[PDB]
Design a protein around this ligand. Structure first.
Ligand SMILES: N[C@@H](CC(=O)O)C(=O)O
Ligand SMILES: [Zn+2]
Ligand SMILES: [Zn+2]
Length: 231
């Protein structure tokens, strides 16, 4: 299995985001995705193959990352993949390497000050993301009703926000920072913390152990990488 196939290919294939500043953001001038998560991926490649250059990055989103893991087209996913009990039944997750929290991105012209001002709001969320469940509960805890519109990817939610087809775009603040602009704002409110793990197909206990041990045993190096990226 899986460590052996990686050695045989001579390459670790990792699914990463391409739109998250400081974590994994495509630098279009160089055609390379750069950030903390990419640096963690390179450290894992170095651990397995002895060389951080022996890696291939595949851009994924919340919808596509699962299927690419399922069919073996990536070996691991390091792509803001929130650990949840439901997801742990489907995939293996390492212990967390970082944590963020869900936020709300809204047009400045709405003059929303907090979620409490958003009764009746249509909130745009991604298909396959944790967001709908978390914001629903946040809203219920302060006694307001909201509705949701689901989208296949993040650029489409931002376009919906700009067109006023939704009243807010909700997801991890890490991701919202990749979409905020002069006409919009991320509210100060923070919601359910999102703990991110390195995700592997449930195929292979040995590889899951390797990856979990990696996060634990390279914790200091990973934390230093977070600092280098401003995290
Ligand atoms: N972190 C969130 C959103 C995302 O990764 O796109 C999730 O795992 O659903
Ligand atoms: Zn920044
Ligand atoms: Zn090690």
């Amino acid at each position: 299995g899986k460590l052996e196939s990686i050695k045989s290919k001579g390459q670790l294939i990792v699914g990463v985001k391409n739109d998250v500043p400081h974590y994994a953001l495509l630098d279009q001038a160089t055609g390379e995705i750069k950030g903390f998560e990419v640096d963690v991926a390179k450290l894992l490649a170095k651990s397995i193959l002895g060389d951080d250059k022996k890696i291939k990055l595949v851009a994924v989103n919340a919808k596509t990352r699962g299927p690419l893991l399922d069919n073996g087209s990536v070996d691991a996913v390091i792509a803001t993949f929130t650990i949840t009990p439901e997801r742990k039944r489907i995939y293996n997750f390492s212990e967390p390497y970082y944590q963020d929290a869900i936020g709300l991105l809204v047009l400045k012209e709405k003059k929303y000050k907090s979620l409490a001002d958003m009764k009746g709001a249509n909130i745009g969320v991604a298909q396959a993301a944790t967001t709908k469940k978390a914001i629903g509960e946040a809203a219920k805890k302060i006694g307001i009703d909201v509705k949701f519109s689901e989208f296949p990817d993040y650029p489409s939610i931002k376009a919906a926000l700009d067109a006023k087809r939704v009243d807010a775009f909700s997801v991890d603040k890490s991701i919202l920072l990749g979409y905020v602009d002069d006409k919009s704002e991320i509210l100060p409110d923070s919601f359910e913390p999102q703990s991110y793990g390195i995700v592997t197909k449930k195929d292979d206990p040995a590889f899951a152990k390797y990856v979990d041990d990696f996060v634990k045993e390279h914790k200091n190096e990973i934390d230093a990488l977070a600092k280098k990226w401003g995290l």
